């Protein structure tokens, strides 16, 4: 009968109907804990099956992606698109190409995507997709043929107002190129708004490449200022060395912080006097090389396959690689080494035991649906540019991005306090994200 | 031979082809009277069967709307959509749910919509729709089911560039939600431009709820200033108590006037010190109660089922309920009692004998196609925002609404003056409306 | 390098990719166990990733199905449509509404449908779908609304040349009516070919009701015909009581044959010289009762509830209910009782432990995919009639159903000889099913 | 081995595959000469059959256009739409109605259009169309019937994101009205972005009428400044007397130059003291007369059917009529007479010999794809306004046009000097145009 028990019962239904999907469970569990708080103050938010509707995807698509390799052998990978919620706008979210991908992972990401997209203040619903295809070691022509095969099925389920994909792990500028190209061929339309993360001469927006890392740094700055500090002269750990990590690093150093290390999935680098960003980019973008190559070619910088990047003494930790990369034990050692701020660039990097640790140890924590929202926000700006056939300057778009991140910070911190959990940005994000979606779902009827 | 005979013989054919539609005949007759004046000076506005094309709807849809009530009983209502003219833009116009609705009524409203929409200066054609469904006493779920059944057929005839409905009598925010939600579900597109009057978190515009009533008051203020007067300190009658009336009342009293009465279909309330808007909104929108309840609960306010609201001594009358609610006897009484200005919030509220009494008694008269155009204007601003994926502030949109009502007034005043009927805004509005639609029609050929 | 190392490594990959779906794993294993044989003799059947393509669904759809109950209360169920293979024709297969339905099960049934449909000789591919919706204890309104909600998503993925569903458990004539009606509403097309199982006056086929039943028996008419054991008089234990079983029984006394009683998921029966269907059909379809409401009669019919349905004296046995109703103690005490033939009517009616108890125990099997194909065969005849706008007489359709069932037995016999496991009809069924589909995929390229 | 050999062999291919299309060979020849310069520095622009793809149209449509004349007599003309390249945006370019029209000509125009459109800076791909129809001598109703028949086939190959036509020789404001109107009828969409050159009250843009001639004069003005001279006080020849000629004349005279002659296909007029623009416009647009009538009605102006317009002594020649109207001998006559600047209002007016004479006589030469791009740049601005449902003022749009033409000149000059050929604006335009397009094509894959 109590809120606590209504919700725990749906969660047990959810476990039943979604068996075998631990990451999806993890995401829903974090959100449902926050919804308890919301339904204790405002019980009409449970009316008309709203929660049952919310955690069930509108549509899910799983399809065969055949493709021919350079030796002329045929392979078959699995493609996914989860269209989770469209109450606020077309489904919006990226595409992950990594051998780990399964439906459970795509759903975890699409579900998070709802609340994130809601927080942007922009008109976007949530979705995600990807494939268990492994782009590593493939030639451009293999990637191209895969993108083409994948988009051959996906084209009929997407569109400027329907579902707008983008990149993620394994999907950068190159793959979005092949995807968009082949979309136009399938549809016989130059429909710029169908994808975000496009190149600048064919419909893309200026700050999008930098957006997720910039936005994450902009958000952590807000958290730092609200505690009475400044990001200048702070020491920062950034896990990852892909799209998000690179630009979080760049923005942290423009604002006067020092990034004392970064990583790939092979290991990590200690850079106690900061990162040479041009160098890291030559290394990852041109050479496609490992973080260890940086260490060898940069004096002061040393490679490590032992322990964890989280063993470093820091003020601020920005996890920007993947889900569940920062466990309870990682969280203990950062707290013991003097870390006062954590903000997630990645989607769900912190395990639930790490998030509990941060709270017990009075560490300020920016959840991913808030701190990494600069990307999807800037994607929505790309969409807006496309719908107007306009093209904005870097300085204009970046200003928009700065203001979006401040406003997300502000609604997270105000919503948190409104519901009696001041400085708990998880609660704040989850509730503000949820309320905008729910109020739109109630307006629009049972659909 | 004579222009007079030509237009009159055509009107005679149109009574034959549209037998049994008095309201359509009445709207057509008033316009055609003004067209006689245009054609006496510029006979080439009659070329290419232009008037014969204008007065025949491009398309009319009538359809069965079956729905199930809360007792599991099946009901069947009739749905309508008239797509009248599309020379200037997509068909644009609201939906009326009321038990009096038939094809004649939908056509009168569609026809008027052509000229009003033209007058806004914005790129919108004319249509209207509705059903003979009666929303009164229906539950939210019964209304949702009706809207969903209604839109199951209508979805295929509408679209962002095709036909963009909105609300009207019986169709407000609630119903627009249900219609929009179901459209998205029928189309599988989050196509914001398909309806206007949407809610602020799913593609609506800031001033639209208030726009018609606000616009009506803006328009009448220009009429008033044209005579050397101000709206501040005037006593104003506003018939009706829905969307138009509420905000006409709100605007008028913000500008320092006093609204001395309002009404619904059951009777009328005398409010000599003005109207408490928040109390009337609670009664109408939360409780869906009669205006008699306002009088019960508000001191100074008296309920009447005898006589007419038009019996009150006023400076300004704003009919904001329905067609033919202010007749010739009403018009004499108003004039006798000191009324100097009439502007139509509603569509065609004044009967032809009432309009002539205003002419005989030199009462300044603002016809609905000009005075109530703020609504559809602000709707076009909703479509403009949606096309750009942009959201404008309340102040920005309200300022645009102001300029637009001032431009409309000016166009009606200058055009009347141009054609020899100074201060006859009916003539000016009809002619100014007509000329722009005609010029576009001639340019786009026989279609 | 060996033929058993491709197979077992793909079988192993397939366990990673489709984790948690053991029925699909089983069904893929048995089919692969047969492809080993085909490869030794015909090596080109593994070319161009043929098997990797065959075991991955062309497309899988999972969607939210919201619906409202008689109390005005919102529920959310999950709907499915797997469109496995279309090499021989449009996707073909039924819809199951039952609380045990999940992606794994739909996939397994859809996979088996490919080869079942291939064996018939007709232009049908394979698919399946349904929902976790529980049609037990629902009003007709609730089932209609559910059907309406379900078809509102499903209609955009189906069609006469695309995908043609049918009934199965939980989806009988009534549901097909509701689905077909709403399909027409969404499409604005009387597209009779979109579904099979339709009523007679709106595009149905005359033998469809009696087909799966008449099927199991036309098959036996060559299967026992190879041995002796009389062209008459043999007992038939008929495990089920819906469309397939009721009519399997109904196809009794063709030219003289004792019957014994039957079951559901409550309890079973035993009887003298017959079981007269007249009385089962008024209580199982038109009233919807239990098997207790037949067995309270029937001048002999008695009702057992704790034991097992496979402890009757046989000597022929015709299940026809769900997957997984014959295991360790049933299969061995089926054989015990000097007991000989079988012609099982479910989708995968016996388990992998029961199949060895029919192989080793010399039991002449009539498999799932071959002997109860008369249903799908007659679906295709419905598609044929719709395509030509013809309605065939009963005699004619029944005759065509006899031809088809001859050929299925023939191709099962001839191909089981051709690969030297002669009369293991499981094998020729399984190989002939595979080769037609494989051959079509090879001809049609990498798609 | 050499780039010279590689490109020349390709050209010999192209000559064979496209036999009998000289205008197309001519246009491809001049572009391929500039591309040799690109490949000697950056030879990976030939990667992935880039050039082979660029020179083969994406799609070409040739269709029957039947229509009935005012005497009830049936005629049959041929219609073309070539959709050349869509890398940078939807296909964009005009329609030509003239008796000389054939496929080879449409392709010449379409090919130039790719590079022109690239040069603007705006998101538009390349295409063109037309008909062999001769609108000379036809009634307005004949022209409407032809446009209606033409668009009955064309509408399905076009669209706001697909292909957006416009005017060109024989297709002005009147024809675009008929075309647009019929498009809306075919599509049932008020899709403003489908065409440019539209009228001001139905989605057109201010400045579009003037844009090509205006833009040409803005370009030549930059060429002149770059020699350290000034346009004011110069004598200018403008050939032609249609859309482009008219507004080049107006702009050149506004800037303080004297236009000393102009023409139609029947002869030329010598206007030693300048052109009376209002008079010309009245003769050409209202009376649809020959330029001889201008000479008859204006003292000091003289009609000539002898010799050539290019016999006049001038400082600047602006051919604004048609392809290959200024030949070898014409170029010598102009050079010898003191001409110092040639800018092309028309598409490809200067013969290959003419251009040689210019290079050798030190005459500055503004190729069409740069100098006449103001037209299509302003069409893209019309698309932009339409996509935003917005209307821009004349001042604002004409300032956008001025900046764009300055930027085109700048990119031609800089690019030409960059690749070792300073002041060769042909080289600069061709390389700058190619590079954006080629970059976009590489990103989008083999499509
Ligand atoms: N791109 C966006 O706009 C965006 C927006 C919001 C959120 N995100 C999230 O940001 C995260 C990374 O995104 P990205 O776009 O930057 O992807 P990316 O460019 O592919 O980079 C991912 C980085 O993470 C590394 N990585 C993968 N697994 C790892 C592990 N277990 N430990 C350490 N490093 C690991 C990769 O290294 P290897 O080369 O060794 O695999 C690579 O350096 C994801 O969680 C994604 O959902 C991205
Ligand atoms: N909403 C817009 O944007 C808009 C724009 C331009 C023009 N209009 C026009 O403005 C007028 C009012 O629209 P609304 O949107 O305010 O509708 P609404 O919110 O449904 O309100 C209608 C009001 O008028 C009264 N009324 C309705 N029918 C009546 C009748 N037949 N006799 C006497 N009183 C009656 C109603 O009282 P009961 O409850 O007793 O029926 C109610 O108070 C209509 O003529 C409409 O076409 C509306
Ligand atoms: N013509 C066709 O429909 C067709 C064509 C090809 C294949 N099939 C296959 O044939 C089978 C029968 O389907 P149907 O169309 O006859 O469905 P149906 O009309 O809904 O009847 C199914 C019957 O099976 C019973 N059952 C459930 N659990 C059982 C258990 N553990 N042991 C014994 N019986 C049980 C049901 O009892 P309750 O009512 O108590 O649940 C019910 O009497 C299915 O496996 C289907 O895939 C059918
Ligand atoms: N309109 C645009 O926006 C635009 C943009 C870029 C480029 N262009 C190019 O500019 C040139 C002219 O364009 P515009 O047509 O749009 O003006 P237009 O209104 O059609 O007028 C064209 C003029 O050229 C003359 N002419 C046509 N063919 C001729 C020939 N074969 N020999 C001698 N004179 C001839 C015509 O005389 P007659 O009346 O005697 O035929 C007429 O005065 C074309 O090359 C076109 O492709 C136009
Ligand atoms: O910009 C996008 O849509 C990609 C965003 C995304 O997938 C994410 O927010 O993690
Ligand atoms: O289209 C709208 O905004 C509703 C306005 C309308 O139909 C009216 O002008 O009465
Ligand atoms: O599609 C058909 O007709 C029969 C196949 C099937 O799986 C069913 O209906 O239960
Ligand atoms: O504006 C257009 O697209 C028509 C003009 C054209 O085709 C051109 O630029 O030559």
PDB file of C-alpha atoms in Angstrom, chain B residues 8-194:
ATOM      1  CA  UNK B   8     -26.464  38.842 -56.828  1.00  0.00           C
ATOM      2  CA  UNK B   9     -27.003  36.109 -59.420  1.00  0.00           C
ATOM      3  CA  UNK B  10     -23.987  34.287 -58.081  1.00  0.00           C
ATOM      4  CA  UNK B  11     -25.355  34.576 -54.494  1.00  0.00           C
ATOM      5  CA  UNK B  12     -28.624  33.120 -55.858  1.00  0.00           C
ATOM      6  CA  UNK B  13     -26.739  30.058 -57.314  1.00  0.00           C
ATOM      7  CA  UNK B  14     -24.960  29.695 -53.955  1.00  0.00           C
ATOM      8  CA  UNK B  15     -28.279  29.528 -52.047  1.00  0.00           C
ATOM      9  CA  UNK B  16     -29.267  26.657 -54.388  1.00  0.00           C
ATOM     10  CA  UNK B  17     -26.054  24.662 -54.116  1.00  0.00           C
ATOM     11  CA  UNK B  18     -25.985  25.231 -50.273  1.00  0.00           C
ATOM     12  CA  UNK B  19     -29.681  25.003 -49.359  1.00  0.00           C
ATOM     13  CA  UNK B  20     -30.391  24.693 -45.630  1.00  0.00           C
ATOM     14  CA  UNK B  21     -27.136  26.429 -44.420  1.00  0.00           C
ATOM     15  CA  UNK B  22     -28.276  29.853 -43.098  1.00  0.00           C
ATOM     16  CA  UNK B  23     -25.046  30.686 -41.242  1.00  0.00           C
ATOM     17  CA  UNK B  24     -22.929  30.033 -44.389  1.00  0.00           C
ATOM     18  CA  UNK B  25     -25.303  32.227 -46.437  1.00  0.00           C
ATOM     19  CA  UNK B  26     -25.028  34.966 -43.824  1.00  0.00           C
ATOM     20  CA  UNK B  27     -21.205  34.996 -43.740  1.00  0.00           C
ATOM     21  CA  UNK B  28     -21.013  34.833 -47.544  1.00  0.00           C
ATOM     22  CA  UNK B  29     -23.589  37.642 -47.992  1.00  0.00           C
ATOM     23  CA  UNK B  30     -21.623  40.179 -45.855  1.00  0.00           C
ATOM     24  CA  UNK B  31     -18.366  39.485 -47.686  1.00  0.00           C
ATOM     25  CA  UNK B  32     -20.011  39.633 -51.109  1.00  0.00           C
ATOM     26  CA  UNK B  33     -21.536  43.057 -50.195  1.00  0.00           C
ATOM     27  CA  UNK B  34     -17.993  44.351 -49.649  1.00  0.00           C
ATOM     28  CA  UNK B  35     -16.818  42.671 -52.913  1.00  0.00           C
ATOM     29  CA  UNK B  36     -19.345  44.645 -54.888  1.00  0.00           C
ATOM     30  CA  UNK B  37     -17.280  47.735 -53.846  1.00  0.00           C
ATOM     31  CA  UNK B  38     -13.977  46.185 -54.951  1.00  0.00           C
ATOM     32  CA  UNK B  39     -15.326  45.061 -58.348  1.00  0.00           C
ATOM     33  CA  UNK B  40     -16.933  48.421 -59.188  1.00  0.00           C
ATOM     34  CA  UNK B  41     -13.375  49.911 -59.085  1.00  0.00           C
ATOM     35  CA  UNK B  42     -11.320  46.837 -60.195  1.00  0.00           C
ATOM     36  CA  UNK B  43     -13.505  44.512 -62.338  1.00  0.00           C
ATOM     37  CA  UNK B  44     -10.556  42.099 -62.992  1.00  0.00           C
ATOM     38  CA  UNK B  45     -10.873  40.641 -59.486  1.00  0.00           C
ATOM     39  CA  UNK B  46     -13.797  38.667 -61.027  1.00  0.00           C
ATOM     40  CA  UNK B  47     -11.619  37.096 -63.787  1.00  0.00           C
ATOM     41  CA  UNK B  48     -10.965  33.400 -64.050  1.00  0.00           C
ATOM     42  CA  UNK B  49     -14.058  32.427 -62.010  1.00  0.00           C
ATOM     43  CA  UNK B  50     -12.172  33.744 -59.059  1.00  0.00           C
ATOM     44  CA  UNK B  51     -15.138  34.391 -56.778  1.00  0.00           C
ATOM     45  CA  UNK B  52     -16.798  31.113 -57.878  1.00  0.00           C
ATOM     46  CA  UNK B  53     -13.560  29.384 -56.741  1.00  0.00           C
ATOM     47  CA  UNK B  54     -13.291  31.363 -53.547  1.00  0.00           C
ATOM     48  CA  UNK B  55     -16.750  30.509 -52.247  1.00  0.00           C
ATOM     49  CA  UNK B  56     -16.418  26.744 -52.968  1.00  0.00           C
ATOM     50  CA  UNK B  57     -14.311  24.780 -50.410  1.00  0.00           C
ATOM     51  CA  UNK B  58     -11.297  23.102 -51.832  1.00  0.00           C
ATOM     52  CA  UNK B  59     -12.255  20.063 -49.696  1.00  0.00           C
ATOM     53  CA  UNK B  60     -14.807  19.002 -47.173  1.00  0.00           C
ATOM     54  CA  UNK B  61     -14.582  15.922 -44.967  1.00  0.00           C
ATOM     55  CA  UNK B  62     -17.463  14.405 -42.982  1.00  0.00           C
ATOM     56  CA  UNK B  63     -16.836  11.202 -41.051  1.00  0.00           C
ATOM     57  CA  UNK B  64     -18.275   8.866 -38.463  1.00  0.00           C
ATOM     58  CA  UNK B  65     -16.782   9.189 -34.968  1.00  0.00           C
ATOM     59  CA  UNK B  66     -17.735   6.142 -32.924  1.00  0.00           C
ATOM     60  CA  UNK B  67     -16.743   6.188 -29.231  1.00  0.00           C
ATOM     61  CA  UNK B  68     -17.484   4.172 -26.075  1.00  0.00           C
ATOM     62  CA  UNK B  69     -18.774   5.836 -22.880  1.00  0.00           C
ATOM     63  CA  UNK B  70     -17.947   4.933 -19.276  1.00  0.00           C
ATOM     64  CA  UNK B  71     -20.867   2.423 -19.084  1.00  0.00           C
ATOM     65  CA  UNK B  72     -19.476   0.506 -22.069  1.00  0.00           C
ATOM     66  CA  UNK B  73     -22.163   1.969 -24.407  1.00  0.00           C
ATOM     67  CA  UNK B  74     -21.270   2.830 -28.006  1.00  0.00           C
ATOM     68  CA  UNK B  75     -22.142   6.351 -29.248  1.00  0.00           C
ATOM     69  CA  UNK B  76     -21.716   7.730 -32.764  1.00  0.00           C
ATOM     70  CA  UNK B  77     -21.029  11.300 -33.598  1.00  0.00           C
ATOM     71  CA  UNK B  78     -20.351  13.137 -36.788  1.00  0.00           C
ATOM     72  CA  UNK B  79     -16.890  14.689 -37.494  1.00  0.00           C
ATOM     73  CA  UNK B  80     -16.180  17.563 -39.870  1.00  0.00           C
ATOM     74  CA  UNK B  81     -13.221  19.201 -41.521  1.00  0.00           C
ATOM     75  CA  UNK B  82     -13.509  21.945 -44.137  1.00  0.00           C
ATOM     76  CA  UNK B  83     -10.319  22.879 -45.939  1.00  0.00           C
ATOM     77  CA  UNK B  84     -11.556  26.004 -47.565  1.00  0.00           C
ATOM     78  CA  UNK B  85      -8.692  27.797 -49.167  1.00  0.00           C
ATOM     79  CA  UNK B  86      -4.936  27.240 -49.277  1.00  0.00           C
ATOM     80  CA  UNK B  87      -3.614  30.069 -51.443  1.00  0.00           C
ATOM     81  CA  UNK B  88      -1.666  31.808 -48.682  1.00  0.00           C
ATOM     82  CA  UNK B  89      -0.544  28.794 -46.663  1.00  0.00           C
ATOM     83  CA  UNK B  90      -1.718  25.508 -45.097  1.00  0.00           C
ATOM     84  CA  UNK B  91      -5.393  25.399 -44.145  1.00  0.00           C
ATOM     85  CA  UNK B  92      -5.597  26.868 -40.630  1.00  0.00           C
ATOM     86  CA  UNK B  93      -8.457  26.896 -38.163  1.00  0.00           C
ATOM     87  CA  UNK B  94      -9.933  25.385 -35.069  1.00  0.00           C
ATOM     88  CA  UNK B  95     -12.184  22.538 -34.079  1.00  0.00           C
ATOM     89  CA  UNK B  96     -15.624  23.022 -32.486  1.00  0.00           C
ATOM     90  CA  UNK B  97     -17.204  20.323 -30.310  1.00  0.00           C
ATOM     91  CA  UNK B  98     -20.772  21.375 -29.598  1.00  0.00           C
ATOM     92  CA  UNK B  99     -24.150  19.748 -30.185  1.00  0.00           C
ATOM     93  CA  UNK B 100     -25.225  22.490 -32.655  1.00  0.00           C
ATOM     94  CA  UNK B 101     -22.399  21.770 -35.110  1.00  0.00           C
ATOM     95  CA  UNK B 102     -23.322  20.862 -38.716  1.00  0.00           C
ATOM     96  CA  UNK B 103     -21.743  21.424 -42.135  1.00  0.00           C
ATOM     97  CA  UNK B 104     -23.263  24.890 -42.596  1.00  0.00           C
ATOM     98  CA  UNK B 105     -21.743  26.100 -39.369  1.00  0.00           C
ATOM     99  CA  UNK B 106     -18.312  24.603 -40.185  1.00  0.00           C
ATOM    100  CA  UNK B 107     -18.404  26.338 -43.616  1.00  0.00           C
ATOM    101  CA  UNK B 108     -19.380  29.752 -42.274  1.00  0.00           C
ATOM    102  CA  UNK B 109     -16.391  29.479 -39.852  1.00  0.00           C
ATOM    103  CA  UNK B 110     -14.072  28.148 -42.557  1.00  0.00           C
ATOM    104  CA  UNK B 111     -15.115  30.933 -44.935  1.00  0.00           C
ATOM    105  CA  UNK B 112     -14.566  33.703 -42.371  1.00  0.00           C
ATOM    106  CA  UNK B 113     -11.205  32.037 -41.531  1.00  0.00           C
ATOM    107  CA  UNK B 114      -9.916  32.687 -45.049  1.00  0.00           C
ATOM    108  CA  UNK B 115     -10.167  36.511 -44.710  1.00  0.00           C
ATOM    109  CA  UNK B 116      -9.134  36.693 -41.063  1.00  0.00           C
ATOM    110  CA  UNK B 117      -6.033  34.617 -41.749  1.00  0.00           C
ATOM    111  CA  UNK B 118      -5.237  36.766 -44.749  1.00  0.00           C
ATOM    112  CA  UNK B 119      -5.515  39.881 -42.598  1.00  0.00           C
ATOM    113  CA  UNK B 120      -2.936  38.696 -40.106  1.00  0.00           C
ATOM    114  CA  UNK B 121      -0.244  39.238 -42.742  1.00  0.00           C
ATOM    115  CA  UNK B 122       1.029  35.655 -41.934  1.00  0.00           C
ATOM    116  CA  UNK B 123       1.207  32.642 -44.343  1.00  0.00           C
ATOM    117  CA  UNK B 124      -1.941  30.661 -43.497  1.00  0.00           C
ATOM    118  CA  UNK B 125      -4.936  29.471 -45.473  1.00  0.00           C
ATOM    119  CA  UNK B 126      -8.466  28.911 -44.052  1.00  0.00           C
ATOM    120  CA  UNK B 127     -10.339  25.918 -42.710  1.00  0.00           C
ATOM    121  CA  UNK B 128     -12.463  24.745 -39.747  1.00  0.00           C
ATOM    122  CA  UNK B 129     -13.686  21.525 -38.210  1.00  0.00           C
ATOM    123  CA  UNK B 130     -15.531  20.023 -35.368  1.00  0.00           C
ATOM    124  CA  UNK B 131     -18.098  17.570 -34.232  1.00  0.00           C
ATOM    125  CA  UNK B 132     -21.678  17.477 -32.931  1.00  0.00           C
ATOM    126  CA  UNK B 133     -20.221  15.670 -29.878  1.00  0.00           C
ATOM    127  CA  UNK B 134     -21.187  17.427 -26.647  1.00  0.00           C
ATOM    128  CA  UNK B 135     -18.273  17.569 -24.175  1.00  0.00           C
ATOM    129  CA  UNK B 136     -20.446  18.772 -21.254  1.00  0.00           C
ATOM    130  CA  UNK B 137     -20.809  16.119 -18.508  1.00  0.00           C
ATOM    131  CA  UNK B 138     -18.312  13.763 -20.170  1.00  0.00           C
ATOM    132  CA  UNK B 139     -15.480  12.358 -18.103  1.00  0.00           C
ATOM    133  CA  UNK B 140     -11.788  12.988 -18.998  1.00  0.00           C
ATOM    134  CA  UNK B 141     -11.535   9.400 -20.309  1.00  0.00           C
ATOM    135  CA  UNK B 142     -14.702   9.760 -22.378  1.00  0.00           C
ATOM    136  CA  UNK B 143     -13.238  13.006 -23.860  1.00  0.00           C
ATOM    137  CA  UNK B 144      -9.901  11.274 -24.526  1.00  0.00           C
ATOM    138  CA  UNK B 145     -11.608   8.423 -26.302  1.00  0.00           C
ATOM    139  CA  UNK B 146     -13.612  10.895 -28.394  1.00  0.00           C
ATOM    140  CA  UNK B 147     -10.507  12.858 -29.393  1.00  0.00           C
ATOM    141  CA  UNK B 148      -8.671   9.628 -30.204  1.00  0.00           C
ATOM    142  CA  UNK B 149     -11.512   8.327 -32.367  1.00  0.00           C
ATOM    143  CA  UNK B 150     -11.883  11.757 -34.036  1.00  0.00           C
ATOM    144  CA  UNK B 151      -8.147  11.916 -34.833  1.00  0.00           C
ATOM    145  CA  UNK B 152      -8.035   8.349 -36.105  1.00  0.00           C
ATOM    146  CA  UNK B 153      -9.806   9.606 -39.203  1.00  0.00           C
ATOM    147  CA  UNK B 154      -8.508  13.264 -39.221  1.00  0.00           C
ATOM    148  CA  UNK B 155      -4.823  12.408 -38.923  1.00  0.00           C
ATOM    149  CA  UNK B 156      -4.625  11.481 -42.564  1.00  0.00           C
ATOM    150  CA  UNK B 157      -5.992  14.839 -43.834  1.00  0.00           C
ATOM    151  CA  UNK B 158      -3.809  17.079 -41.723  1.00  0.00           C
ATOM    152  CA  UNK B 159      -0.128  17.924 -41.312  1.00  0.00           C
ATOM    153  CA  UNK B 160       2.368  20.751 -40.696  1.00  0.00           C
ATOM    154  CA  UNK B 161       2.101  22.092 -44.312  1.00  0.00           C
ATOM    155  CA  UNK B 162      -1.307  20.614 -45.185  1.00  0.00           C
ATOM    156  CA  UNK B 163      -3.794  21.561 -42.478  1.00  0.00           C
ATOM    157  CA  UNK B 164      -3.087  22.706 -38.869  1.00  0.00           C
ATOM    158  CA  UNK B 165      -6.065  22.645 -36.547  1.00  0.00           C
ATOM    159  CA  UNK B 166      -6.512  24.245 -33.121  1.00  0.00           C
ATOM    160  CA  UNK B 167      -9.336  24.786 -30.529  1.00  0.00           C
ATOM    161  CA  UNK B 168     -12.687  26.655 -30.554  1.00  0.00           C
ATOM    162  CA  UNK B 169     -15.973  26.127 -28.643  1.00  0.00           C
ATOM    163  CA  UNK B 170     -15.564  22.884 -26.617  1.00  0.00           C
ATOM    164  CA  UNK B 171     -11.862  22.434 -27.629  1.00  0.00           C
ATOM    165  CA  UNK B 172      -9.254  23.840 -25.281  1.00  0.00           C
ATOM    166  CA  UNK B 173      -5.914  22.733 -23.900  1.00  0.00           C
ATOM    167  CA  UNK B 174      -7.189  19.397 -22.610  1.00  0.00           C
ATOM    168  CA  UNK B 175      -8.584  18.214 -25.943  1.00  0.00           C
ATOM    169  CA  UNK B 176      -5.549  19.501 -27.900  1.00  0.00           C
ATOM    170  CA  UNK B 177      -3.354  17.270 -25.782  1.00  0.00           C
ATOM    171  CA  UNK B 178      -5.381  14.214 -26.448  1.00  0.00           C
ATOM    172  CA  UNK B 179      -5.622  15.032 -30.227  1.00  0.00           C
ATOM    173  CA  UNK B 180      -1.944  15.733 -30.487  1.00  0.00           C
ATOM    174  CA  UNK B 181      -0.892  12.634 -28.541  1.00  0.00           C
ATOM    175  CA  UNK B 182      -3.011  10.496 -30.784  1.00  0.00           C
ATOM    176  CA  UNK B 183      -1.848  12.170 -33.988  1.00  0.00           C
ATOM    177  CA  UNK B 184       1.721  11.312 -33.011  1.00  0.00           C
ATOM    178  CA  UNK B 185       0.686   7.784 -32.363  1.00  0.00           C
ATOM    179  CA  UNK B 186      -1.142   7.548 -35.763  1.00  0.00           C
ATOM    180  CA  UNK B 187       1.695   9.175 -37.711  1.00  0.00           C
ATOM    181  CA  UNK B 188       4.686   7.926 -35.628  1.00  0.00           C
ATOM    182  CA  UNK B 189       6.155  11.405 -35.889  1.00  0.00           C
ATOM    183  CA  UNK B 190       6.635  14.015 -33.221  1.00  0.00           C
ATOM    184  CA  UNK B 191       5.345  16.603 -35.713  1.00  0.00           C
ATOM    185  CA  UNK B 192       4.818  19.734 -33.595  1.00  0.00           C
ATOM    186  CA  UNK B 193       3.489  21.910 -36.461  1.00  0.00           C
ATOM    187  CA  UNK B 194       0.387  19.721 -36.945  1.00  0.00           C
TER     188      UNK B 194
END
